[PDB]
């Protein structure tokens, strides 16, 4: 009867539709990146889109994820420049969760993506 | 003829519609929070919504901004828990930009929002 607790670094299937232009849309996996307190009590979560239309990480705001270890359709890339705040009503099901090493890559990609690295 | 550049810390009027549930929607001012390299060359920007339904920070992911200095309709709040990636076609017009001190608060609130602080 109780909630399934949403933790940072979890991967959920989410309905991002509809979108415009180069925004990632459709029903796709997303990784929770909001802090755990916000995830426990807020009506919204902050996610980063995952796409399988590309294979390599190319740019430093992208993070690759294996298909086997994280049980996806194919080798995919976390897009830390494709972020959105979703009402929890958009969450369909929990797919898996990212390892500690993989979430450190997501952390570093967010620092770059949002210009948070103290430069000098 | 050229387009004025988009810089982190700028405040743009942007069309966020449509949305669902507790997500911020409509056509409202938003703060550019993506790095400037992305803002110059990427087809998308990353923004944080500004709301007028509160005028005082409810949590440490909220940052207040006075209407007079930043040309708002009323005293508003930047919601660093309401961030989204927008195609630049949604950007309507640049309203203003935040001071260095105010962007420091935005940086700190974003660090809490996305669980990026040390530990």
């Amino acid at each position: 009867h109780s909630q399934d607790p949403i933790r940072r670094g979890d991967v959920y299937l989410a309905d991002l539709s509809p979108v415009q232009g180069s925004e990632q849309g459709g029903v796709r996996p997303v990784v929770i990146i909001q802090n755990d307190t916000g995830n426990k009590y807020s009506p919204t979560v902050i996610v980063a889109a995952i796409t399988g239309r590309i294979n390599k990480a190319k740019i430093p705001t992208h993070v690759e994820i294996e298909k086997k270890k994280y049980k996806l359709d194919k080798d995919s890339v976390i897009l830390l420049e494709q972020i959105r705040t979703l009402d929890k009503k958009r969450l369909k099901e929990k797919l898996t969760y990212l390892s500690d090493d993989k979430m450190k890559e997501v952390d570093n990609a967010l620092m770059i993506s949002l210009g948070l690295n103290a430069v000098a | 003829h050229s387009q004025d550049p988009i810089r982190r810390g700028d405040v743009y009027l942007a069309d966020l519609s449509p949305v669902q549930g507790s997500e911020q929607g409509g056509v409202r001012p938003v703060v550019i929070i993506q790095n400037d390299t992305g803002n110059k060359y990427s087809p998308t920007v990353i923004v944080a919504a500004i709301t007028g339904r509160i005028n005082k920070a409810k949590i440490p992911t909220h940052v207040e901004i006075e209407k007079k200095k930043y040309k708002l309709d009323k005293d508003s709040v930047i919601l660093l828990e309401q961030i989204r990636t927008l195609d630049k076609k949604r950007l309507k017009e640049k309203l203003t930009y935040l001071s260095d001190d105010k962007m420091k608060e935005v940086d700190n609130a974003l660090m809490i929002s996305l669980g990026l602080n040390a530990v």
């Epitope: 180069s22 740019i59 | 050229s2 988009i6 990427s42 076609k89 950007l91």
Partner: nanobody
């Protein structure tokens, strides 16, 4: 009502040049950033070049930068692509595409798709072979 018609494609030898054009009508051409994207046989869409709604800002893919030049004349409601130093890898159908907004127009690094743009032309064929 809305139409983007390309012209100016053709057959050239390697090292030749071409001037593509794309005429707009049915919508406010000056309110839209314009793109050129090309598609080779059996390949996905490759973004080529971008120009903002006013014409002052241009962007190019690394594969064409320096060889191609995008421009626009909002009085004629026409977009141009000047192609020089053509090579066989440039053989493709070339589409113009529009996206509204004064701040649109940028460098595309992902694979592009038709729904990522507002309006699409019918394409013009470019073939580079001796």
């Amino acid at each position: 009502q809305v139409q983007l018609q390309e012209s100016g494609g053709g057959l050239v030898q390697p090292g030749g040049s071409l001037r593509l054009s794309c005429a707009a009508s049915g919508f406010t051409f000056s309110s839209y950033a314009m793109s050129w994207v090309r598609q080779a046989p059996g390949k996905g869409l490759e973004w080529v070049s971008d120009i903002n709604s006013g014409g002052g800002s241009t962007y190019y893919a690394d594969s064409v930068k320096g060889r191609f030049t995008i421009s626009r004349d909002n009085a004629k409601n026409t977009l141009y692509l000047q192609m020089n130093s053509l090579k066989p890898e440039d053989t493709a159908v070339y589409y113009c595409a529009a996206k509204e907004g004064p701040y649109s127009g940028s460098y595309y690094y992902m694979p592009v798709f038709r729904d990522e743009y507002d309006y699409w032309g019918q394409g013009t064929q470019v073939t580079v072979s001796s």
